[PDB]
Amino acid sequence: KSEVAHRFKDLGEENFKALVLIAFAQYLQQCPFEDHVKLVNEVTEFAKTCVADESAENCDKSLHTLFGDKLCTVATLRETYGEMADCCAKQEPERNECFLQHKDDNPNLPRLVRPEVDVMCTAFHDNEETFLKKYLYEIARRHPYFYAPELLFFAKRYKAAFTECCQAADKAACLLPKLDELRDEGKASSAKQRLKCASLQKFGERAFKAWAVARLSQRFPKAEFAEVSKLVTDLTKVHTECCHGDLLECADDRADLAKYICENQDSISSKLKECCEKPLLEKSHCIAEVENDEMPADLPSLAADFVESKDVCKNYAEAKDVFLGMFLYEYARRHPDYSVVLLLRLAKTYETTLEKCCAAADPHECYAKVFDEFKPLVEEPQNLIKQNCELFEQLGEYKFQNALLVRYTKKVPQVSTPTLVEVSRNLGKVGSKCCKHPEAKRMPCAEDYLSVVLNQLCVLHEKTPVSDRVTKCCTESLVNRRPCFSALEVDETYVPKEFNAETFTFHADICTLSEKERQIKKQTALVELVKHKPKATKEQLKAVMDDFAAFVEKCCKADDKETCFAEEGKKLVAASQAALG
Ligand SMILES: CCCCCCCCCCCCCC(=O)O
Ligand SMILES: O=C(O)c1cc(I)cc(I)c1I
Ligand SMILES: O=C(O)c1cc(I)cc(I)c1I
């Protein structure tokens, strides 16, 4: 009878308020914080009214209606947001749709700066609620497409870091490494979110469904293809709605399928226990990040149903996709250690083959070498992992990063130096975060990270194209979007830059800089050094890097910094210029 009272009761006053806040923030991104805190109170006083009497006036209205109604209460709506106020003249079906429309994705607001640990902790003390609500409001208005409940999930992890660290003697050493982790986790989570909706739009349902099938069947290797199909179907509807940006429609669609999975739990996965015992607002998130189930191990084989058994072209022509979907389902679940793309890379190969064999005299003997063709497709990413995780051990994260720097700068020297550095730094991290895992969980790991990075890297070329090559892979299918980069070859067309002493003039500042800064500084010159002399051997370059490692010491450990950087520096650039000939 009352949508509001209902949401209140199973959500709770605490979470209800937080969400209302995030909600209004994602829409009225220009209104001040103190302004929303009022709305949230206004709205919460209301809800409480319905919980007491479901019949109380307006409690019968739909949330989409009540919401829109309040939004149109903002007097400065016309002045502040303008065009968006026009929405208030249409009635509900259109109105809400009209709001989702004029919702700015990335509004021009000032970069949020992280205050001093001590000022943070102190602010967290006098008024911890308003402290978090304000930063919640700040993050919200900056990412209006971000799933509220998930945003609320990060919020609490932040309060646990402030609760724990602001009590320690060494606050900074406690707080800082967590704030860095959370930041990088929310960034990753946001990018994937914006990444999923992009794929759904560029390649469409089929590709998305294929993807989902392989991933779903990897997690639930015991569920039957029928169930997987069901879920993959419901799933895609969810992401279509959530992408569209309607909070309520997306919140319910996710709640439903979460209930369906938990009720039919025993028919899906054994590792869904906990997730199903959690509250409404967390079940979904829980399930989505759930672990793989153990595989039947009583499994037959694939060459039996997909390479041998005549009547494959019969079963294939009857329902081309379901058949292929079965292949995936079948192959995926037997390989939780492959990357989803890898699997889609195989399914496609199979599709391609079936299409060039079911149209020949004796098909049975045309596609009997297929599996043999999966071999190279599998080993490429497998070799890449070992190779790169081996090197990451031979050198630290930092020393490893420099290897990539030199490696990629050579591929696309055209790319901006500050870009090559950042990109090269993130790749190193992916390497450290994943190489820690055993062979089994490696490939899936790399895929998770490499996916966002590669996209983030592509979105830039999107605004400032530089290389036709980087542009060729960025546009290609998500399934070829990675092996393409791995295929780039050192650019021989590139014409070396000209010397600029300034770029190789290091004044005694570096001596007093944080590791983050000392590196970025050194690394930036490294890229510049390769852009200048791109034909330097891994040998020639190692040398210059050595004569520079010592140099830094000899001048930031000597009684006359500044003189050492100018006198000794002239010797490096000179000697170096000559070494690299
Ligand atoms: C034209 C030659 C000028 C020499 C410029 C040297 C730039 C090398 C920076 C590389 C620093 C490597 C990092 C490190 O050693 O810790
Ligand atoms: O700017 C971002 O990329 C971003 C996104 C989310 I969602 C959470 C957090 I913290 C951040 I720093
Ligand atoms: O997209 C997901 O990560 C996902 C997966 C399953 I399985 C169930 C639900 I609800 C979700 I939101």
Ligand 3 near 287 CB (within 6 A):
yes
| 8 Å CB contact between 250 and 196 | no
310 is in an annotated binding site: no
> Token pair of 479, please?
């399934």
Place of tokens 């993959």: 232
Give residue ranges with CB within 6 A of ligand 1.
402, 504, 522, 525-526, 529, 532, 544-545, 548-549, 572-573, 576-577
Which ligand sits closest to the CA of 540? 1
Whole-number Cα distances in Å, 181 to 120, 175, 376: 17, 10, 36
- Dist. CA 77–CA 54, nearest whole Å: 31
Ligand 2 near 114 CB (within 6 A):
no
- Dist. CA 427–CA 442, nearest whole Å: 14
What one-letter code names the amino acid at 273? K
- Dist. CA 165–CA 534, nearest whole Å: 47
Whole-number Cα distances in Å, 401 to 181, 388, 389, 470, 510: 19, 11, 12, 20, 19
The DSSP result for 354-401, as a single string, is HHTTTTSS-GGGTSTTTGGGHHHHHHHHHHHHHHHHHHHHHS-HHHHH
Nearest alpha-carbon partner for 404 in 373, 383, 426, 386:
426
DSSP count for the chain of H helices, then E strands:
28, 0
Q: Gaps after which residues in the chain, C–N over 2.5 Å?
A: none
Ligand 2 atom 1, closest CA: 187
244 is in an annotated binding site: yes
Substitution candidate for ligand 3 out of 208, 209, 233, 287 with most atoms within 8 A of CB: 287
Place of tokens 């290389």: 467
Place of tokens 């190279």: 376
Coil, helix or strand at residue 177: helix
| 8 Å CB contact between 104 and 89 | no
The DSSP result for 504-519, as a single string, is G---TTGGGS-HHHHH
Substitution candidate for ligand 2 out of 22, 152, 156, 190 with most atoms within 8 A of CB: 190
560 is in an annotated binding site: no
What one-letter code names the amino acid at 370? V
Q: Does 294-379 match 492-571 in CATH topology?
A: yes
Long-range contact list for 320-323, CB < 8 A, 24+ apart? 321/206, 322/229
| 8 Å CB contact between 276 and 245 | no
- Dist. CA 340–CA 345, nearest whole Å: 8
| 8 Å CB contact between 33 and 137 | yes
| 8 Å CB contact between 39 and 69 | no
The DSSP result for 533-558, as a single string, is STT--HHHHHHHHHHHHHHHHHHHSS
Domain 2-104 falls in which CATH fold? Serum Albumin; Chain A, Domain 1 (1.10.246)
Coil, helix or strand at residue 472: helix
- Dist. CA 23–CA 419, nearest whole Å: 34
Q: Crossing angle for the helix pair 225-243 and 204-219, nearest 10 degrees?
A: 130
Class of the domain covering 202-293: mainly alpha
Long-range contact list for 482-487, CB < 8 A, 24+ apart? 482/341, 482/450, 482/454, 483/380, 483/381, 485/454, 486/380, 486/384
- Dist. CA 544–CA 572, nearest whole Å: 8
| Chain centre to alpha carbon of residue 552 | 37
Atom of ligand 3 nearest to the CA of 289: 3
| 8 Å CB contact between 57 and 175 | no
Provide the CATH number for the domain formed by 492-571 in this structure. 1.10.246.10
Q: Crossing angle for the helix pair 3-11 and 280-288, nearest 10 degrees?
A: 70
Please report, for the chain, the start and end positions of each structural domain, with discontinuous segments joined by +.
2-104, 105-194, 202-293, 294-379, 380-491, 492-571
| 8 Å CB contact between 184 and 160 | no
> Token pair of 304, please?
């039996």
> Token pair of 6, please?
């209902």
Half-sphere exposure of 351 (CA within 13 A, CB side): 16
Indicate the Cα dihedral angle 187, 105, 240, 270, nearest 10°. Answer: 20
Domain 294-379 falls in which CATH fold? Serum Albumin; Chain A, Domain 1 (1.10.246)
Q: What is the CA radius of gyration of the chain?
A: 28
Place of tokens 């070859």: 489
CATH 1.10.246.10, domain 105-194, yes or no: yes
The helix (H) or strand (E) run that includes residue 124 is helix 117-126
Provide the CATH number for the domain formed by 380-491 in this structure. 1.10.246.10
What one-letter code names the amino acid at 198? A
532 is in an annotated binding site: no
Solving technique: X-ray
- Dist. CA 101–CA 108, nearest whole Å: 18
Which ligand sits closest to the CA of 146? 2
Substitution candidate for ligand 2 out of 26, 178, 183 with most atoms within 8 A of CB: 183
